């Protein structure tokens, strides 16, 4: 029985810039020309 | 060196909290969500056309 100083205490990640894009859900809208004749 | 020693250190080893990557849980797929309707607008419009 002899104390011998057993205890030996001893002891950002990646900063950066981010840009977040979402998936596009807006439907593509174009212009349709409808030609028709009405016979009454 | 056989007279031995004294382990007076009081252990306080606290394990770190393990990392958790949360899942993006999805209950109903989009197909089921579209198929969960009595009336579908696209079908009605196609039949009218």
From Swiss-Prot, chain A:
Q: How is it modified after translation?
A: A proteolytic cleavage by host furin generates two subunits that remain linked by disulfide bonds.
What part of the entire protein does this chain span?
Answer: 103 to 148 of 907
Q: Where in the cell is it found?
A: Virion membrane; Host cell membrane; Host endosome membrane; Host Golgi apparatus membrane
**What does the UniProt function comment say about this protein?**
Envelope glycoprotein that plays a role in host cell entry, cell to-cell virus transmission, and fusion of infected cells. May be involved in the initial attachment via binding to heparan sulfate together with the gM/gN complex that binds heparin with higher affinity. Interacts with host integrin ITGB1, PDGFRA and EGFR that likely serve as postattachment entry receptors. Also participates in the fusion of viral and cellular membranes leading to virus entry into the host cell. Membrane fusion is mediated by the fusion machinery composed at least of gB and the heterodimer gH/gL.
Name of the protein in question = Envelope glycoprotein B
- Protein family: Belongs to the herpesviridae glycoprotein B family.
The subunit field of the Swiss-Prot or TrEMBL record says: Homotrimer; disulfide-linked. Binds to heparan sulfate proteoglycans. Interacts with gH/gL heterodimer. Interacts with host C-type lectin CD209/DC-SIGN. Interacts with host ITGB1, EGFR, and PDGFRA.
